[model samples]
Target: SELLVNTKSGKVMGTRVPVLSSHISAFLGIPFAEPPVGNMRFRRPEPKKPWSGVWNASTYPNNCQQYVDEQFPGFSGSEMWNPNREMSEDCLYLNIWVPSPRPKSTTVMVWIYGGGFYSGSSTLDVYNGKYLAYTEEVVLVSLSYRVGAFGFLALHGSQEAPGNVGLLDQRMALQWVHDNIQFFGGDPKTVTIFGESAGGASVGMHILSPGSRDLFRRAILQSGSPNCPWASVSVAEGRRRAVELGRNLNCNLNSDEELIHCLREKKPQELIDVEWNVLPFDSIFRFSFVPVIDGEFFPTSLESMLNSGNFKKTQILLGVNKDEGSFFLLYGAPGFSKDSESKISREDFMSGVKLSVPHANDLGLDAVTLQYTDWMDDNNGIKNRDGLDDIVGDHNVICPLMHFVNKYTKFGNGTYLYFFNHRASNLVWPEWMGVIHGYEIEFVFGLPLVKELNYTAEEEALSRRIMHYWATFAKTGNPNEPHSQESKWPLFTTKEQKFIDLNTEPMKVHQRLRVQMCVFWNQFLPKLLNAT
Candidate 1:
């Protein structure tokens, strides 16, 4: 039953699954980097020591230690996104699924999962690569890395604990793939890095990283960007959080070395159990820990880099879900009700919008509310609730993403944009949730092809089109080139601002989805900021 293959680490065996009438070899839970434990904690990941004998790569590995019971009642999709695998400090492993009797011409796709950079793993059920590998005809890889304090604790200016180690872990994993993917019958040169949420931000970070410039050929960011307010923190803020954590853990903060050593002695669960308050902002965007602008990995802010044209120029497919804000705002509210008919108050709406744009003043705030609110339906609470949903979607995800794409496209980079409006029937959230964040994963991975998942004919066709578009982009950096029909995903430009509306029927190309809102953010907001 052993399907053996050679890897840089050693000989390993994977299992063959005949799920899609396509026999695919799944090499699961292979270590890509040395486990960051004890002395290695908070440090950059080191290369995995080469193994001696055949390593059994069949079982799913441990996920990094995160809050096991972490969830949001109506929004988090704990039923879907929760990590089912075991947890441990030693969790720097990656999994790969390859089509059996590997094809000579195969592109590689590396998936980095998103849990706001605090939680997520490769072993989750949704991340199973069999369907994507079989249907798309590409080698699929998913990876696990340190999360929370284990991954992202930063010192003021200490070299021992420069932040963004989670990012560094991802970079090392990409390096591992570049060096070892050829043995699995993959083209090292044609690698595409993609992810959702924090993972999407990670891909953006790599695009901005000079060290990661040569590792990947293309990137797809689904509902996330480095420019997202929650994606990064200042060096001073990171240090403040680090000291707070040390104080919470009852460790001496006399020196960075002593403090690091004290933290190293802490049990993984103890560190995970500590409740670090969310930095100031709307609850939707607040994260306890995140990547910071460490002078080494991130020498400057992403905005600064973008302004100076210091990032990589690569083919990028960037977009956001129509109702991404529902996930962030619906459950996190103080008295969030599950009833579909329940309404959000005007005060709630204003507070959220204000917190979201902390820099905005009375005039700017009034402008945003006036633009998003449907004054006619203000009497009906449901209308106000809908307005709040739109506000969260635009403020937290859509506007920031569009702003980044606008800047990126000006650099003459080949960029394709899409608006994900299709909602799957198998979604864990309610129909009232609309097409919220992370709903696009199933379609992108062709999950409908799996036996347990059910899909209508139209949805199945849509999934096929999306997989083809994604795999083609991975292979050739253009989603439209491989399709036979005249379905054109127009390249994004400042003049046209074109994007495809991804729906069940014939995909329609449109110029500017919300021109007014975009203008308010991209043009009006900047002027307001300067004026203030």
Candidate 2:
């Protein structure tokens, strides 16, 4: 039988599970916003109208419409990454799992899933909140927002269709929590927003948003930042993509009004089926229909605002994986295999470098190669391929992240930084890949043990440390106050540049990470931007 609770909208029925001496009540498929369908398509999310009787929140809702490819029997593919639920356009839902016998001082965590701002779902099994909520004694929430062109098509100057509908959806959900979490035994003012990859980028964007500034008290960003190359596009560029999408959809594009009306009339699949090509010349971070500088939510460029110290002063914890570029470089490589052996050659490595930074002339390219590569040895012996992967990792993930952390620390905000270096014990990839992107998700949620994933004792201990630290941060805005068995997690300082190095055994506080590479990229990037 399901338990019933009254919400601002109406009464909801949720399932209860006894777990680890504590029980958790799960309220699934709660609509945070009205369905963005029919004439409402492409418009900003509207508040969910109050419902009548008992609403069944036990069953999961349809996942937001996204592209999902076929998966083989023994191999993990797109299916593993996406939620196994129905798919549809009406997908602005949020799920929550609150611990029974909830404490008065409960922490609330809101998770925003990431798939390059194009794919992801709140109903994915990996995102189940019971374990985290019950084990850590926090109220856990996960939300689904629109993705692909359905969410971010920026038809500027048109009142009917503005961009960043997805971000607006996230903001509305946060608002819902702020106004309604108290009934679930949560402190609305103590909520912490967190996510990985594009979701992490969304958290960072929320930190900059005036609309979202007062909703959450803290944030955690895993392996993503607003300064990443693919996070945002200019208004002109966004409009170009919107017009291009219209042309592909056989809609009139002479004016934004005409374009939006025609697009609103098309089927969801027709819009989803429109292919957006990724040119080899574009870098690994390239994406279609990501967040845009929509004048309202984003008054200026994120880099400019971040540098000028014009963002919210929320407490924040941020970090990146050791090998954020491995999967990115190998995913579609010429001779790549999903479950087999292959090697990236020096020729391929250099080609990727050129493609990654096409604006960098031979001088800059040679400088980068010379700094990272050991050219004194033979081709395969040189380890240039590994060096190339590091280049992409630093360029697309690490350095830009460091730039943000440094600037954010300079603002004297409550900032904590970490570096994720431990590999999962049951890792399917080769050692060369080394702690690939999003690997931290499984550990962060303690999903490995639940899924019977092979893990070392050290990894188990590390997972406990991470969960405690994250939960503690959400509660008190300080990760170390309600400290766990782990050592003191020090604050990041501009003077010493200290950060917690999260690994298999004990966590250690370290000074600069990738010092030499950071120095080179920090100096070269401004020049690259100028030259472009």
Candidate 3:
């Protein structure tokens, strides 16, 4: 009934391999931080003291305050996470999966789940992380952090509650990994931080965070695009939102202390729901729960920071699914329509472009939109009239940002870019939802548990390749060694701007990315570029 494992404390922790499943061994539900309750509800994450006993880690930890089905529509609740556990303030725990009966040299992959900065859990079946550890010979990790109002409320008054408590929590988790993962056969020096959707965005935050530099050596981000690259919001607007939250929540304050008291006393789950209700489009960006550019943890827009060579040394692999916007259309926002495109006049497009990229309006967005509309003529080609708006969305939302990465990664660092181009036939949603957002998740994790989804032989091969590359990066800063049976992965740079486009046949470099992106983002870029 007992197993042995060495700990850094020169002690042995129980490491029993279950009689039923030899492939999975775990140290689960280990508290990574002191409970962020009462006085610490919205403060930085605190470290846990060394324990005298081997803690029970057989089950998943409780999820932070979050809404699973409410965010990911059509997903069965049981399919995502355990049904019995209640949400709690005492939820800053993490889980680990070590594949072998004795894993001693495994690289670590710490996962951050995504739900637009508001809702997510580390317990999703898709992130089981068991198979990846066993099959790929790596350590897999997942952790929970605060979300929504409790995590991201940017207090405007003269106070020290800086925006991005969630980001701080992530930082704390990495610190825990650095201090503790070695006991689980994970190499702390060889760590790769990976995430999808909001998790991907979180990884982006880690990359930009000055405190997180030594915490992780490599980053993998998928499907989450960076925020307004070069524009500053009215300090007045942020303050107004904070005040509005206070008024709506009945936290009417005589002073900052009174407001803080009222907020802390409120039920955490209710506050999270309220934050979403206030946001106009059910979009996470409208709330106070996401990472912020508060000049301390994160100094500026990721664009400006990267342009300033902040990420020149970080190894990165970034990409998005083919139809990333379809998820918004189906679940969060209504779909982009042809009629809507027709209604959007040249002036309207130009105005929106100005708002998005204030400095470079003359860069010609109106023409770009029309050109994209032509390029996406009915979704058959990269150009389609019906799908051109998507091209614009891709350009403005993902491409230029990628260009920035491609440009900087050329200066002697490992970087790779990919496009998930697999088309799906399941559910028969829309004629053009093609390969929708978050679809790459199953492929990435290579789960055999999803009932509705199934992986092909090719998909399995691709998954193995990605796992190898990811684990390699975790063990070393480069994803180059222990190459997969697939093509030798190429590092991207500006001049060639070469990236792996994962599609049928699967091999192309310098595939004319900038030219394609320029046409799409022409309208949005100029306004921002022209801004002082």
In model 2, the Cα lDDT at residue 216 comes to 91
CA error at residue 348 for candidate 2, angstroms? 0.8
How many pairs of residues collide in each model?
A: 0, 0, 25
Candidate 1 vs candidate 3: which has greater TM-score?
1
What is the per-residue lDDT of model 1 for residues 1-532, given as tens digits with 9 covering 90 to 100?
4368787788888878775765888888899889888899888899999998888888889889886644554444665676777788899999998887876647999999998888988887777888888887899999877889888898857767888889989999999999988888889999999999899889988988899878998999999988887788888888888888888899899999989889889998888777455354445656777999876777687888888878889899989999877766665654245555546677777776675566677888888888877777665566666676777777767887887888888774699999999988767666666898888888888877665677777888888888888888888889987547666888888899899999887878888767678788767877877898
TM-score of each: 0.94, 0.94, 0.82
Q: After superposing candidate 1, which stretches have Cα over 4 Å from the reference?
A: 69-76, 358-367, 526-532
Off by over 4 Å in 3: 1-21, 68-85, 156-160, 225-238, 277-288, 335-371, 375-397, 410-412, 424-431, 448-453, 477-486, 504-506, 518-532
Q: What tens-digit string does per-residue lDDT give for candidate 2 at 1-532? A: 3267788988888988766556788889999899999888888999999899988998888899886654344455335676589889999999989887655557899999988888899887767888789888899999889998888888777767788999999999999999888878888889999999999989989988888889999899998987787777777888888888888888887788889889888888787787464222455657788888977998888878888888888688989999887776676444334554445567776776776665577877777777777767627622755676688789878888888788877774688899999888787777777888888987788765453566877777788778878998888878886535546888888889889888876667888877778878887656765675
Residue-wise C-alpha lDDT for candidate 3, range 1-532, written one tens digit per residue: 2234444322333343432245467766777778888878767777776666666566777877765454434544223533236678788888787765556666789998877676777877677787777767788888878876667666644444555677778888888889878777788877888988778767866776677888877888887644423112233444555555667788866766677777888887657656644432323123344565666776665667776777426678877676665444333233333223233343433333333332233544444445444433323332332243364345433664465465557553677777777764342344555676666776677653333366556666666666766677666666667545646667666666667766545666545444566544644445544562
Cα-based lDDT for every prediction: 0.82, 0.81, 0.62
